[PDB]
Design an enzyme around this catalytic site. Structure first.
Site, PDB file in Angstrom:
ATOM      1  N   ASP A 105       0.862  -1.188   0.000  1.00 36.14           N
ATOM      2  CA  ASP A 105       0.000   0.000   0.000  1.00 36.14           C
ATOM      3  C   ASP A 105       0.905   1.248   0.000  1.00 36.14           C
ATOM      4  O   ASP A 105       1.824   1.287  -0.804  1.00 36.14           O
ATOM      5  CB  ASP A 105      -0.955  -0.070   1.217  1.00 36.14           C
ATOM      6  CG  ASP A 105      -2.103   0.938   1.172  1.00 36.14           C
ATOM      7  OD1 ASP A 105      -3.166   0.612   0.590  1.00 36.14           O
ATOM      8  OD2 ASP A 105      -1.948   2.028   1.745  1.00 36.14           O
ATOM      9  N   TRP A 151      -8.924   8.266  -2.415  1.00 28.78           N
ATOM     10  CA  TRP A 151      -7.776   9.040  -3.008  1.00 28.78           C
ATOM     11  C   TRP A 151      -8.199  10.478  -3.287  1.00 28.78           C
ATOM     12  O   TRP A 151      -7.352  11.370  -3.230  1.00 28.78           O
ATOM     13  CB  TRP A 151      -7.274   8.423  -4.345  1.00 28.78           C
ATOM     14  CG  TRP A 151      -6.526   7.092  -4.130  1.00 28.78           C
ATOM     15  CD1 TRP A 151      -6.836   6.108  -3.283  1.00 28.78           C
ATOM     16  CD2 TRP A 151      -5.358   6.804  -4.744  1.00 28.78           C
ATOM     17  NE1 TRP A 151      -5.857   5.179  -3.390  1.00 28.78           N
ATOM     18  CE2 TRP A 151      -4.960   5.598  -4.275  1.00 28.78           C
ATOM     19  CE3 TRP A 151      -4.630   7.447  -5.673  1.00 28.78           C
ATOM     20  CZ2 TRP A 151      -3.847   4.977  -4.696  1.00 28.78           C
ATOM     21  CZ3 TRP A 151      -3.458   6.828  -6.126  1.00 28.78           C
ATOM     22  CH2 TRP A 151      -3.063   5.601  -5.641  1.00 28.78           C
ATOM     23  N   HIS A 270      -7.001  -7.172  -0.290  1.00 23.65           N
ATOM     24  CA  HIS A 270      -5.876  -6.235  -0.254  1.00 23.65           C
ATOM     25  C   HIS A 270      -4.774  -6.561   0.742  1.00 23.65           C
ATOM     26  O   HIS A 270      -3.597  -6.261   0.487  1.00 23.65           O
ATOM     27  CB  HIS A 270      -6.431  -4.863   0.064  1.00 23.65           C
ATOM     28  CG  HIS A 270      -5.412  -3.777   0.146  1.00 23.65           C
ATOM     29  ND1 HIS A 270      -4.639  -3.400  -0.931  1.00 23.65           N
ATOM     30  CD2 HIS A 270      -5.089  -2.937   1.160  1.00 23.65           C
ATOM     31  CE1 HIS A 270      -3.876  -2.375  -0.580  1.00 23.65           C
ATOM     32  NE2 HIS A 270      -4.128  -2.079   0.682  1.00 23.65           N
TER      33      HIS A 270
HETATM   34 CL   LIG Z   1      -2.078   2.820  -1.696  1.00 18.16          CL
END
Ligand SMILES: [Cl-]
Ligand SMILES: [Cl-]
Ligand SMILES: [Cl-]
Lengths: 289, 292
Positions: A105, A151, A270
């Site tokens: 990440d 984001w 993830h």
């Molecule tokens: Cl990220």
């Protein structure tokens, strides 16, 4: 303490201390976490790695128990270029000027930026479940805006996200952790690890750092990436890309940014080192040996 | 809460989907005014009196907004889609005996308005849309710059209860920051403080905030799909249309609406997003001339 047989060090740098758990012996290997986690996300794979390597498990600048450098209008200390410079200084304090690196990440963004800026520092590089920041933003259409909304949201000018996050930070952080796992709940995590993440996220100063990181991610980090893709720059360091199975393949994308890269999907959401610790550890050990 | 429409009547109008609150004034040809987010019918208070000199003016709260009822939503956000809202307001206007009327909408209400024109053009004599492009066009434009500049379309559309829980701690701060953010100067000076208090009291109700999120969820999903069908068929609104936008609002908007409408005229006004509050005399004049 989730790291049996690891020491605890604050490592001095010109921008502030970096906290790390340090264990094992052999070739040096630095592990870098991302959002919204700390170094403890490596607790399930660090021991198998320490069987073969000296393993340094660091909190990113401004994350976990690392110090928080003062930011500025261009979010400089939380740019991946600056974070990489700071972690290079920290590794020099331990006498490591050439080392192996695995990131996840945000920490994986530090890692490929490190490899682009200072390839001579790295023997081998692994990045877990990311594409380059440039590629994300190039992919940012309706479907992506909806899927990775944070984001843009966390990058909004202060104090808009800081203000919203203060109301119920436990809920937000636990929802992020759950939402990106295969399972959709917190069952892939050790409850002790979740409590480390919650405790960090509970601090307004730590949350501000996270937003600064995403602000950098939308602005300077993107510009730094754009310069390399425009120049045709590729990472020369032997590289591994792992990604969670749960568009071009990630390997197709990293082959455009790196000249010696291999890769594979892991059956995982993830959070590879926590959801799929056995497969992740095996892949890293094979790669870095 | 202030009465910002001196002498206008008040009505709750029943529909099969729940009551619509409206202020009603004037006399003449019927003109429906629809607000958007994060506002209520009171955003028309600086132009409604002027319009009421020439028209029978119906100033309605959108379904689920202000004092209108809030239907329970569903997995497709149906009652807060613009197609459903348009059907509901068609029913409300029928209750008043208006089956063919003039329409001006702003923001979400403008989206209800152009969807109404695409689904049921015979209901409208003329239509005005204030400071919007079609939902399909906003999402088509989507790239890094727009994702960053107009983040709330993706944020408020996230699955419940994520935005609801984030808005809950300090709702006043969020609604006031949004109002201020889209004005020309970036502050609250353009608004009547009594109108801001209407907006704030609405936003202070978690049920009203949930409706707003459902509106944006529709905006990301069914509303976009409905628009997509029309653009890929080359369907254009035949109703005479006015597009009015703020020079510091959208983004050429006329070029965009010419793809969606076969008889459209348009102009910018020096204003942020909130045309009827920031530029009331110019907005009223433009509307009176167009609808007359
Ligand atoms: Cl990220
Ligand atoms: Cl809108
Ligand atoms: Cl728009």
């Amino acid at each position: 303490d989730l790291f049996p047989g690891f020491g605890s060090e604050w490592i001095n740098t010109s921008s502030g201390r970096i906290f790390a758990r340090v264990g094992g012996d052999g070739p040096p290997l630095l592990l870098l976490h991302g959002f919204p986690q700390t170094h403890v996300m490596w607790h399930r794979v660090a021991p198998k790695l320490a069987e073969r390597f000296k393993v340094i498990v660091a909190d990113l600048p401004g994350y976990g128990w690392s110090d928080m450098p003062e930011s500025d209008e261009q979010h400089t200390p939380y740019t991946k270029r600056a974070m990489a410079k700071q972690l290079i200084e920290a590794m020099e304090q331990l006498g490591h000027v050439h080392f192996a690196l695995a990131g996840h990440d945000r920490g994986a963004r530090v890692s490929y930026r490190l490899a682009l800026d200072s390839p001579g520092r790295l023997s081998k590089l692994a990045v877990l479940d990311i594409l380059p920041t440039y590629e994300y933003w190039q992919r940012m259409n309706r479907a992506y805006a909806l899927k990775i909304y944070h984001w843009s949201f966390l990058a909004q000018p202060a104090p808009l996200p800081e203000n919203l996050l203060g109301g119920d930070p436990d809920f937000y952080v636990k929802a992020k952790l759950a939402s990106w796992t295969r399972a959709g709940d917190l069952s892939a995590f050790d409850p002790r690890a979740v409590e480390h993440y919650r405790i960090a996220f509970a601090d307004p100063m730590r949350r501000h750092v996270m937003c600064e990181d995403y602000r950098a991610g939308a602005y300077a980090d993107f510009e730094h990436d754009k310069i390399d893709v425009e120049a045709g720059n590729k990472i020369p360091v032997p590289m591994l890309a792992l990604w969670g199975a749960s568009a071009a393949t990630p390997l197709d994308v990293w082959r455009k940014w790196a000249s010696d890269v291999q890769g594979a999907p892991i059956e995982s959401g993830h959070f590879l080192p926590e959801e799929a610790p056995d497969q992740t550890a095996e892949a890293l050990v094979r790669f870095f040996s």
